[PDB]
Amino acid sequence: NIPIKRINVPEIGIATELSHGVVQVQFYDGSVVSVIPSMQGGGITYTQPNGTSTHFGKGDDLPFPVRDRVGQIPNIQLKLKTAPLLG
């Protein structure tokens, strides 16, 4: 969807805020985490380097390496808020 903020997160990857509130992080290994706003159903969509996508909702426990990676998203959300104007 339309990026409204995008920042490089050194040592982690590239983070994007999409126009409808989803936050995505593309990690250095090609994995992607999408954090879905609670208003849109919440949860996490995680795509492995091999292309496999999994949705983790409320009540799903997060396996390795998803749990630790999702644990980094709050700090990245704050970085996106203070991100420069895109461009």
Numbering used by the authors: 658 to 744
Give the published text.
STIL/Ana2, which can then interact with and recruit Sas-6.
1.53 Å shown in green in cartoon representation. six-stranded beta sheet with an alpha helix packed against one side. behaved as a monomer in solution. Drosophila PB3 and CCD do not detectably interact. equivalent fly proteins do not interact in this way. results suggest that its function may differ between species. humans but is regulated in flies, perhaps by post-translational regulation.
